[PDB]
Amino acid sequence: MISATYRLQLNKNFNFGDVIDNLWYFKDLGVSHLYLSPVLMASPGSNHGYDVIDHSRINDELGGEKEYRRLIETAHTIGLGIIQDIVPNHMAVNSLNWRLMDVLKMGKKSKYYTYFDFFPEDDKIRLPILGEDLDTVISKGLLKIVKDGDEYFLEYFKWKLPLTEVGNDIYDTLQKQNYTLMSWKNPPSYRRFFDVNTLIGVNVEKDHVFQESHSKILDLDVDGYRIDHIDGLYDPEKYINDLRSIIKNKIIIVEKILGFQEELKLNSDGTTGYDFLNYSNLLFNFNQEIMDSIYENFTAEKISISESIKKIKAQIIDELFSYEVKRLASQLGISYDILRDYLSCIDVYRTYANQIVKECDKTNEIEEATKRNPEAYTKLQQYMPAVYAKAYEDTFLFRYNRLISINEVGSDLRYYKISPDQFHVFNQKRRGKITLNATSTHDTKFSEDVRMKISVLSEFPEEWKNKVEEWHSIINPKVSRNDEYRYYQVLVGSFYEGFSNDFKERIKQHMIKSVREAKINTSWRNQNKEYENRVMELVEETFTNKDFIKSFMKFESKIRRIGMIKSLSLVALKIMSAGIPDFYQGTEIWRYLLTDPDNRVPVDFKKLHEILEKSKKFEKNMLESMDDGRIKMYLTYKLLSLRKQLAEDFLKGEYKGLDLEEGLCGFIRFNKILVIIKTKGSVNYKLKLEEGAIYTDVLTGEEIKKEVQINELPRILVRM
User: Fold this and answer.
1) Nearest-5° angle of CA 320, CA 326, CA 331?
2) Which one of 205, 397, 440, 645 is at 20 to 30 Å from 674 when CA atoms are compared?
3) Within this chain, do residues 271 and 347 fall inside the same structural domain, yes or no?
4) Could you tell me which residues carry N6-methyllysine (predicted)?
């Protein structure tokens, strides 16, 4: 809403009271709306709040409802708005989820049976939470029947499940229950969120479920809402309408991934911005042909992106979602093979309104089966996003290693770069919409600064090629050439610090997760110890080999400065474009973060206060020593100040794209602000300005006329 959002990760160590203490900092920075993480009661010790255990309570670990209302009123007093993240799709399978425990105790007689998406054909609820199958767990004596006064209880480590009645033996007791315990390998009797057994779907499309689940959160005076995983819902449009029947015209943005040529079909204000994140990211990549050869020659293997993605999707269905897909194929009355091929073929997260993707259904079988049983297909649409996400985001993104800065959530690896002309058109479609411009989130594989530093490798392909060969000769590792190639990129991109013990730990953990997700030489479900040991040997060697360290350090320092210049361009781009700029906590300065949990570390706000205090006025020494982050803080503060002063104009105002030479991207906003940004960090450009026209550089204060040089900073020029 209005001019700028700021994402805050709330938890036990950064609660409602801490947010309140920093409100004046957020207002002075230029932010108009705080973008808060989920606030309803989650499982104790949760760091993200997405594992909801009670819809009727504000989380007490964060400060409770009293402190939440104080936060809202105080923010409003100083003029700040609030956009709240809410989770309507699923709840946590946890002993503290009392609504769920009621179903486990009462079965189909529980009033909450219809609250969750259980498979109707199952008389007993399969609960795949055991580390081993029932028999072995019982012989080991891990299952314990506890007699209390609240009745009887079954205990499995930290699980405490209710018993309806008891016999005189574990087996006799277990056959009298409404549920059945099985190992994690077995399919559940409910829709999960992706492949997570401990997350269960909620039937929010049913009126009484919507009302109870939203009774607390809509009772609060917030300014807008961010809807988590909108694509999991049975009827996304009805849900939005139901919200508006109560909330009226408040801001509603949804978390929804779009294809490159896909248009948002929902009745929402906008999205969290992955479309902007990837469109802008592509403006910074060069020398595709050369990067292809280097990759293909080093790893020595050529693959088709399209065919690869199609086959991984088919494997993902067979290994993770076979049961769910077989159920729906049965209800549609078609072959599992036919259904699996259709799901592996579609290029969108999901379809809406039972619309079939004809190019994947050769205009026959699936469409007619859907006309007869529309219900089964509507149900299938809820699982479509899981297939896409597990195959692409969590498998393929870790395999194709030509320039990994492109391997991000919301990406399409079939695209390597995009001309400024296509970005301009994208911005035209954006005009007037209350949608976000994101560059870093709590879910992105890397932070914006990591992506910009890695993109510099495409500007120096010959030297990069030479370094990789040099490094491989010194460090002769026993990992695949593909994993080795990716490692060098991850290392160069996140380095900023030194070969410390803390950085070594972050790297090791990231690499182990990376190879397991790739699923080529090891995996989460079946770990290859031999290979993982080799991955860890690679890390120890590069962190201790003096010849490697020497070579690496000389190359990295050159790359770092150029990467910072590109980050400044990206920051100016998201604030000056149509749409609303979003900021992940702490990105006011340089932040080189890797994949979750690395990006979930706390931010030092006191330190940020002092940097802002000495960064409200431009000094040439900011360019002299960029490492301190003052230049990034100054650019953020200044542009957000201009934006707030002209908020309406930036949101609804005109956008005019300029045709510049390769390496530059330029445009004019509402016929008053000329924006020149360089996409190629290693080159300096010069541009002749219009006859007579005088301009004022908003960042440096200089008077600009006749010609302008584009060096380390983007040029934001106000016609005078």
Assistant:
1) 145
2) 440
3) no
4) 27, 105, 108, 310, 326, 467, 508, 513, 519, 638
